[PDB]
Motif scaffolding. Structure first.
Motif, PDB file in Angstrom:
ATOM      1  N   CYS A 226      -7.346   2.030   3.393  1.00 62.41           N
ATOM      2  CA  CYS A 226      -6.851   3.379   3.152  1.00 62.41           C
ATOM      3  C   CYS A 226      -7.594   4.035   1.998  1.00 62.41           C
ATOM      4  CB  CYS A 226      -5.349   3.344   2.862  1.00 62.41           C
ATOM      5  SG  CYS A 226      -4.333   2.644   4.187  1.00 62.41           S
TER       6      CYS A 226
ATOM      7  N   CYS B 285       0.836  -1.192   0.000  1.00 70.08           N
ATOM      8  CA  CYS B 285       0.000   0.000   0.000  1.00 70.08           C
ATOM      9  C   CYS B 285       0.874   1.246   0.000  1.00 70.08           C
ATOM     10  CB  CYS B 285      -0.927  -0.006   1.216  1.00 70.08           C
ATOM     11  SG  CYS B 285      -1.933   1.484   1.413  1.00 70.08           S
TER      12      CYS B 285
ATOM     13  N   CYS C 173      -4.265   0.276  -0.172  1.00 68.93           N
ATOM     14  CA  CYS C 173      -4.993  -0.723   0.598  1.00 68.93           C
ATOM     15  C   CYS C 173      -6.494  -0.466   0.519  1.00 68.93           C
ATOM     16  CB  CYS C 173      -4.533  -0.702   2.057  1.00 68.93           C
ATOM     17  SG  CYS C 173      -4.489  -2.314   2.866  1.00 68.93           S
TER      18      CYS C 173
ATOM     19  N   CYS D  84       0.019   2.901   3.714  1.00 69.24           N
ATOM     20  CA  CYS D  84       0.312   2.182   4.946  1.00 69.24           C
ATOM     21  C   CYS D  84       1.340   1.069   4.794  1.00 69.24           C
ATOM     22  CB  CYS D  84      -0.980   1.593   5.532  1.00 69.24           C
ATOM     23  SG  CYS D  84      -1.770   0.346   4.496  1.00 69.24           S
TER      24      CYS D  84
HETATM   25 ZN   LIG Z   1      -3.479   0.803   3.019  1.00 70.32          ZN
END
Ligand SMILES: [Zn+2]
Ligand SMILES: [Mg+2]
Ligand SMILES: [Mg+2]
Lengths: 100, 199, 143, 145, 67, 49, 137, 63, 70
Positions: F35, F14, F32, F17
RNA sequence: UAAUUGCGAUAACGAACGAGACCUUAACCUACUAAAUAGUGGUGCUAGCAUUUGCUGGUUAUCCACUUCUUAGAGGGACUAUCGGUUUCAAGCCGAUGGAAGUUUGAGGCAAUAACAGGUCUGUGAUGCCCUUAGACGUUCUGGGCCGCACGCGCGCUACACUGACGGAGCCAGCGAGUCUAACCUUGGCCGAGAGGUCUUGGUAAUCUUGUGAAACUCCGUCGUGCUGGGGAUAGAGCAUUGUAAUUAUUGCUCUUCAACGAGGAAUUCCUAGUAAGCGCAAGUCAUCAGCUUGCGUUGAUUACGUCCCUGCCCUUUGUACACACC
C-alpha cells in the motif's frame, strides 16, 4: 518588544525560501535586528522497500525519499509586528512555529 | 649539519633527511640500479620516498603502475591472503623489518637487494594457451616476480616459527643471489623450463 | 619549559603514571583484582594482575585530562572491544562498569579527578599538577 | 635469564587429581587439562595459590602443587566466588560445588539419568541422542561419526 | 565516448548559420553569448552547444564546412 | 473473546488494508509495504536515486 | 592563515600564524601523531621545503572525521596548504611558487585533495560492485 | 644462456584465443638494422625492451 | 615443548660461542638453531641485549632484529 | 560512438518513442547570503606546567569579530578546454599540459515497442466464476505445529592460526533513529564480576543520546608452533532481561565440557579503483531475538586497459523440411 524565533519546515524548497525571504524583507523594511535564516539540514527520510508485492523475481529494492528542509529566523519585534509576520506567511506547504 | 631548533623539538635523526643526498630515513635511493636493461622504466626507484605508503592512484590507467615505487608494489602484494586484505600498516611494517633483516645479512642496500631479486625472478619467456612459447613483457616480468616473491614468503611463513618479515628477507636474499633455494627462482625456472619445450 | 601531558603521547606517560600510582602505595584496589576480566567481551583476566588496575587508573586519569568531564558509560564504551561470540560475527561490547566506576572513585579519593557540575568526572587541580609533573619527569628522563 | 640447571629436579608430564599434566606447559594451561577446570578457573586458582604463573608446571615445587590442588578442591573456602563454579545449588543440596575430577562426567551422567528417569523432554532427547537446546535438526549434526 | 548528439550539433549549426559576425573561437565568450541568444534549458547542454560551436568555427577558418 | 494484542504482529495492522504482514512502521506510517508503494507519492515520498 | 586538508572524510583545519616554529596536530607535537609508521608522512611537508626553515611560523592543526590513515594524510595536506597560503598572503608570490614546485613535484596529495570517494552500495550484493553468490540448481 | 635483447618498435596487435598475447615488431639492440616479429604475454608498448631466449622465431598469429 | 623447553644449559657455552657463522639473531633464529626454544627466546634475547653480544636494530614488538657486536 | 551516437551515404522526405538530453547524489568554490541548534579566533573569568609571558587545557547566556572547517540557498565551474598526432573530406580517437574533476567526471533514479499463459486471488473493503456460510472453510479462545530428523541441495556465519590468538594501552568514522497520551534514544550518579538493576537527566532533536571514544587497525607484552593459549560446535550448572506466557533451551551473562575443521574432489560464484577483500556501525523487520537485508563509513590490494576461446547479447548476409519456432 519581544524576542521571537520563527521555525519554518517544509518539503517544498521554493515555498520555504519564498517564505524566508518574505520574513527577511518584512524585517528589513522596518529595520529590525535579526539573526539570519539558519538552514537546518535536509532530513532525508529514506525508506527502502521491495518492488514486488510478492517474493518472486530478481530482488530489486527501491528507495523513496522525503526531504525535510528547515529554517529558523529569530528577531525582535513588538506584538503588532509579531502578529502581522505570523499572519503574512501562509504559503501552502510550509509549517511555521513562532516561539517567544 | 645545520642543527637549528624550533619550539616543537623534532630530532636530528629526522633533521638529517635532506641536508645531504636524499634518502629514506635508513636506506639511500641513489645507489640503486637494476642489473639489466629491460626492467628499466618498470622498476621505480629514484624517485625516493620516506615510506612505502603513497596512497596514490595507480590503477585508473594502464601503465601507471610502473611509476609506483617498487617497494610499495612489494608492500601491496604482501597486502594479500584475504585475512590480511587491507592492513597496509602491517604490510609496510613487514617491509621495514624485512629491509632491516636484509641489511643485517649481507647488507647490500636492502632496496638494491629487493630490486635484484625482482630482476632475477622476472620470467623472460612463458607459455600461452592457443601451449605456445611467447615472450614476457617487462611489466608482466616485474609483476610476476613480485607475486612469486610475496607468495613464496607467505607460504614459507605459513605454519612455521619464523615471521613473515624474515621469510620475505630470506626469499629476497636468495632471489637476488639467484640461488635455486628461493621459491620465486624455482618457479621462474619452471616457467622458463616449459618455455623451450613448447617452442 | 612548559611541558604538559600532551607532550608524551600514548605509552610512556601511561606506564610512568601507573608506576607512580604503584609506588605511592595508596592502592584503592577494590579486591576485584585477579577475579575480573575488565569486560564481558574479553576471554581472560589481565595478564599482570599486580599493576593492571594501576594502568587502568593512569589511563582513565590521562583520558579525563585530555578532554572535559568523562563518565562511567563513556569509559565502558572506550575500554570495551569486540567480543568473539563463537560462530556469530563480532560486535562491540561495553567494558566492565564496576571497574571503571571504582577507578573513578579511587582517583577521586586520591584527588586526581572530581565530580563535574555537568556530570561525569573532570580532572582536578591536583590531578593536573600530578599529571604535569609525571609528563615533565618522563620527558626529562627519556625523550 | 637465570640459572635453570636443575639437573634432576624438573618434572615431566606428571600426575594430579588422577590426571596427567604436562610439565612442559606453563602452569595454568598445563592445569587446564583436568576435566572441570578451564583457563579462567586455572588462572584464578594459580593466583590464589600465590604461585608464579610465569613458570612451567614441572619445576614450581612439590608442595605448592598440592596447595593448588587443595585450593582447586575447595574453591568457596579460598575466597573464590560462587559464580566462578560450574556446579551451583546443584540439584539436591544447594551447596556450590566445582566438579573437577574424573567426576564432572559422573555428575553430567547423573543429571542426564535423573532427567530421563523423570521423563523430562531434555532427558528423552538425550536418550535419543538428538540435540536438546531447541536446535534445528533438519540440516546440521547429521553424521556425527 | 564524446560524440555529440543531434540536439547539440543541429543547434550549434544554426547558431553559426545566423551568428557568424558574432561569438569568436573562444568557448568562454561562446557560452556567454549562447546564454543571451538561446534558451537552453540546462547549463550542461548550453556548455555542450557552446563547445561544439567553438570547435565548428575553429575548423571553419581552415575552409568552408559542408552544411 | 480476546487475548492480549499489545505487541507483535497482531498488535498493529496496515492503516489502509488492515494486513498484519509486511508493515512499514518507520516514522509511524503503519502502512503495508505494498500500500505504501501504491500511495507513496501522495504521502510525499519520491524517487531520486 | 586558515587552511584545510581532506583525504576521504577526515578534515584537518590548520592555523598558520606568526610565531616561532611550533607544529601541533591535536594539541600534541608533530612527533606524537601516532600511526608510528606514517609519522614521516606528516614530516614530509616539512623535510621537503626546509628542515627547520622556521623561526617565524606556528602551525596548529585540528583533525576529525575519517580514520587514522585518512587523518594523517589530511593533516599532512593541511599544513602544506597552510604554509603555501601563508607564503602567498604574507611573504611573497615568488617563494610561494618556488616551494609549491617542490610540493607538487613530489606530490602525494600534499596540495590537491584526493577526489576518490566511497562509491554508493547497490542492492543485490554487499559493496558497490560485488554481487551476492548466484546459484542455478 | 646466450644474452640477446630487443626493443619493440611497433605493436602489431592482439592475438590468441582470448586475445591475451600481443604480437609486436621488435628490433634488436645489437645489430639494430634487423627486425623480428614476436609474441608477448604481458602488457607491452613501444620503446620497450624484451629479453628473448631464442633470437630468430618469426611469430605468427595464435589460433 | 617439542624441543628446548626450559634448560638450554647443557651446552651453555653456546651463549658465548654462538656469534660466528651468523650476524642475524631473532626469536625464530633461536628456535630454529637448536639452542633456545621460543618459550624463552624472547627472554634470552633480552638477557644477551642487556649484557652480551647482541645489539638491537629496532624496538619492534612481534619482531626482533639483533646483530653481532662490532 | 556506450548508444538507430553521429559523419555520411541514399527512393526516400520529414517525424515520434527509446539513447541522449533530464533529475538526485559525490567530488571544488580563501566567490555571495547567513548562522550559543555549526565552528574558529581576541579579550574577559580562570586550574596546571613554564614565569618576559609562552603551551594545553576551562569558562552551554562570559566578552567582540569572522565564516577557513560545517550547514544550505542562489549561483560558478567541464565544454573532452589548450596543444600536438592521427584521422578516406568528417564524425571521432590517442597522448601531454592545465584543471577539483577529462571513463558518458563517479554512482544511481527514470527508462521504448512487442511480449511470458513468469509470480502474486496469502497486500488490498481490486476482483469474475466456483465452493463454503451457523457441528462454518466467517470469527474468536486454549493448547500444539510451522523449528519436528536415516538424507540431499542453495544463500551464509565462524574457522583451520604467529600477516595470529590472548592481555593491557593507543582511542579514528559516516549513513541514521528516537516518547505528549507516554514510555522511545538514553547521558550522569550509585550497586553489581558480568548480564543487568536502581535514582535522576537531556532530547519531539545540526541542540540530547552522540564526538554514537565502532571494529578491523596501531603500540607494548604473554603465548611458540603442538588441534596449542587456533577453533568454539555439543553439553551441564547457575544469574538475569523481554514477554500474560521462555518447556522444544527467545536472548544476554558466569564457570565448566572443548567436537569437526591441519586451507577443502569434480565443479562453481562475484569482481576493474576508493573497486575487490577485510572491518564494524545505523536502519528495516522488532515486546525479546541476526549468523538476513537495505544503506553507511574505516583499512584498502593484486591483475587487466584485451578478446570472442567458453557462456551469451546486438546488427548484417546466408541456409532451413523450424513457427509449440532446435527443449
Ligand atoms: Zn497495506
Ligand atoms: Mg519456515
Ligand atoms: Mg535436437
Amino acid at each position: 518588544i519581544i524576542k521571537i524565533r520563527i521555525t519554518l519546515t517544509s518539503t517544498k524548497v521554493k515555498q520555504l525560501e519564498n517564505v524566508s525571504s518574505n520574513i527577511v524583507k518584512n524585517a528589513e523594511q522596518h529595520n529590525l535586528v535579526k539573526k539570519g535564516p539558519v538552514r537546518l539540514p535536509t532530513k532525508v527520510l529514506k525508506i527502502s522497500t521491495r518492488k514486488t508485492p510478492n517474493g518472486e523475481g530478481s530482488k530489486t529494492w527501491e528507495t523513496y525519499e522525503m526531504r525535510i528542509h528547515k529554517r529558523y529566523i529569530d528577531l525582535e519585534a513588538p506584538v503588532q509586528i509579531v502578529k502581522r509576520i505570523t499572519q503574512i506567511t501562509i504559503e501552502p506547504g510550509v509549517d511555521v512555529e513562532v516561539v517567544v | 649539519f645545520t642543527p637549528v631548533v624550533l619550539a616543537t623539538p623534532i630530532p636530528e635523526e629526522v633533521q638529517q633527511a635532506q641536508t645531504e643526498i636524499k634518502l629514506f630515513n635508513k636506506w639511500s635511493f641513489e645507489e640503486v640500479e637494476v642489473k639489466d636493461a629491460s626492467l628499466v622504466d618498470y622498476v621505480q626507484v629514484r624517485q625516493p620516498i620516506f615510506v612505502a605508503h603513497t596512497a596514490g592512484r595507480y590503477a585508473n590507467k594502464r601503465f601507471r603502475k610502473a611509476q609506483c615505487p617498487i617497494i610499495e608494489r612489494l608492500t601491496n602484494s604482501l597486502m594479500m591472503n584475504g585475512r590480511n586484505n587491507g592492513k597496509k600498516l602491517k604490510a609496510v611494517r613487514i617491509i621495514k623489518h624485512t629491509l632491516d633483516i636484509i641489511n643485517v645479512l649481507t647488507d647490500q642496500n636492502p632496496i638494491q637487494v629487493v630490486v635484484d631479486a625482482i630482476t632475477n625472478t622476472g620470467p623472460r619467456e612463458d607459455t600461452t594457451r592457443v601451449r605456445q612459447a611467447v615472450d614476457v613483457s617487462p611489466l608482466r616480468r616485474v609483476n610476476q616476480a613480485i607475486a612469486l616473491l610475496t607468495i613464496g614468503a607467505r607460504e614459507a611463513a605459513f605454519r612455521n616459527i619464523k615471521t613473515i618479515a624474515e621469510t620475505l628477507a630470506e626469499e629476497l636474499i636468495n632471489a637476488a643471489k639467484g640461488s635455486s633455494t628461493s621459491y620465486a627462482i624455482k618457479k621462474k625456472d619452471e616457467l622458463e623450463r616449459v618455455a623451450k619445450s613448447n617452442r | 619549559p612548559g611541558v604538559s601531558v600532551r607532550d608524551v603521547a600514548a605509552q610512556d606517560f601511561i606506564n610512568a603514571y601507573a608506576s607512580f600510582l604503584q609506588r605511592q602505595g595508596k592502592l584503592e584496589v577494590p579486591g576485584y583484582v585477579d577475579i575480573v576480566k575488565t569486560s564481558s567481551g574479553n576471554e581472560m583476566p589481565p595478564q599482570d594482575a599486580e599493576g593492571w588496575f594501576y594502568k587502568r587508573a593512569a589511563s582513565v586519569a590521562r583520558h579525563i585530562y585530555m578532554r572535559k568531564q568523562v563518565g562511567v558509560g563513556k569509559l565502558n564504551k572506550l575500554y570495551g572491544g569486540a567480543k568473539s561470540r563463537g560462530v556469530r560475527p563480532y560486535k562491540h561490547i561495553d567494558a566492565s562498569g564496576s571497574i571503571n566506576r571504582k577507578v573513578l572513585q579511587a582517583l577521586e579519593k586520591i584527588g586526581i579527578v572530581e565530580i563535574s557540575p555537568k556530570g561525569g568526572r573532570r580532572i582536578s587541580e591536583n590531578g593536573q599538577r600530578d599529571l604535569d609533573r609525571i609528563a615533565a619527569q618522563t620527558l626529562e628522563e627519556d625523550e | 635469564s637465570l640459572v635453570v640447571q636443575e639437573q634432576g629436579s624438573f618434572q615431566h608430564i606428571l600426575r594430579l587429581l588422577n590426571t596427567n599434566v604436562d610439565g612442559n606447559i606453563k602452569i595454568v594451561y598445563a592445569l587446564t587439562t583436568i576435566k572441570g577446570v578451564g583457563r579462567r578457573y586455572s588462572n584464578l586458582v594459580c593466583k590464589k595459590a600465590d604461585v608464579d604463573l610465569h613458570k612451567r608446571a614441572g619445576e614450581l615445587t612439590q608442595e605448592e602443587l598440592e596447595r593448588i590442588v587443595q585450593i582447586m578442591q575447595n574453591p568457596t573456602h579460598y575466597k573464590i566466588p560462587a559464580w566462578f563454579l560450574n556446579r551451583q545449588n546443584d540439584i539436591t543440596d544447594g551447596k556450590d560445588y566445582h566438579t573437577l575430577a574424573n567426576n564432572v562426567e559422573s555428575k553430567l551422567r547423573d543429571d542426564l539419568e535423573r532427567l530421563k528417569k523423570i521423563r523430562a523432554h531434555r532427558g528423552i532427547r538425550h536418550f535419543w541422542g538428538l540435540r536438546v537446546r531447541g536446535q534445528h535438526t533438519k540440516t546440521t549434526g547429521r553424521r556425527r561419526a | 565516448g564524446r560524440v555529440r548528439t543531434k540536439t547539440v550539433k543541429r543547434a550549434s549549426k544554426a547558431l553559426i548559420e545566423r551568428y557568424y559576425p558574432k561569438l569568436t573561437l573562444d568557448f568562454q565568450t561562446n557560452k556567454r553569448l549562447c546564454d543571451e541568444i538561446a534558451t537552453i534549458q540546462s547549463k550542461r547542454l548550453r556548455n555542450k552547444i557552446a563547445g561544439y560551436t567553438t570547435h565548428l568555427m575553429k575548423r571553419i577558418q581552415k575552409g568552408p564546412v559542408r552544411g | 473473546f480476546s487475548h492480549p494484542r499489545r505487541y507483535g504482529k497482531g498488535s498493529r495492522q496496515c492503516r489502509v488494508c488492515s494486513s498484519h504482514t509486511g508493515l512499514i512502521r518507520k516514522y509511524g506510517l503503519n502502512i503495508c509495504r505494498q500500500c505504501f508503494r501504491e500511495k507513496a507519492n501522495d504521502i510525499g515520498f519520491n524517487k531520486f536515486r | 592563515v586558515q587552511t584545510f586538508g581532506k583525504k576521504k572524510s577526515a578534515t584537518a583545519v590548520a592555523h598558520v600564524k606568526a610565531g616561532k616554529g611550533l607544529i601541533k596536530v591535536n594539541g600534541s607535537p608533530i612527533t606524537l601523531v601516532e600511526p608510528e609508521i606514517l609519522r614521516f608522512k606528516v614530516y614530509e611537508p616539512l623535510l621537503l621545503v626546509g628542515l627547520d626553515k622556521f623561526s617565524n611560523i606556528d602551525i596548529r592543526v585540528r583533525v576529525t572525521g575519517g580514520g587514522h590513515v585518512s587523518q594523517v594524510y589530511a593533516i599532512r595536506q593541511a599544513i602544506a596548504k597552510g604554509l603555501v597560503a601563508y607564503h602567498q598572503k604574507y611573504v611573497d608570490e615568488q617563494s610561494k611558487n618556488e616551494l609549491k614546485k617542490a610540493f607538487t613535484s613530489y606530490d602525494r596529495t600534499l596540495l590537491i585533495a584526493d577526489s576518490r570517494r566511497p562509491e554508493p552500495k547497490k542492492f543485490g550484493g554487499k559493496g558497490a560492485r560485488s554481487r551476492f553468490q548466484k546459484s542455478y540448481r | 644462456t646466450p644474452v640477446t635483447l630487443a626493443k619493440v618498435i611497433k605493436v602489431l596487435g592482439r592475438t590468441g584465443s582470448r586475445g591475451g598475447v600481443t604480437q609486436v615488431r621488435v628490433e634488436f639492440l645489437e645489430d639494430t638494422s634487423r627486425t623480428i616479429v614476436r609474441n608477448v604475454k604481458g602488457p607491452v608498448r613501444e620503446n620497450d625492451i624484451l629479453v628473448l631466449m631464442e633470437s630468430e622465431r618469426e611469430a605468427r598469429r595464435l589460433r | 615443548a617439542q624441543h628446548a623447553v626450559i634448560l638450554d644449559q647443557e651446552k651453555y657455552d653456546r651463549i658465548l660461542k654462538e656469534v660466528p657463522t651468523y650476524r642475524y639473531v631473532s626469536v625464530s633464529v633461536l628456535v630454529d638453531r637448536l639452542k633456545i626454544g621460543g618459550s624463552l627466546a624472547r627472554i634470552a634475547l633480552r638477557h644477551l641485549e642487556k649484557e652480551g653480544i647482541i645489539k638491537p636494530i629496532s624496538k619492534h614488538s612481534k619482531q626482533a632484529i639483533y646483530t653481532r657486536a662490532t
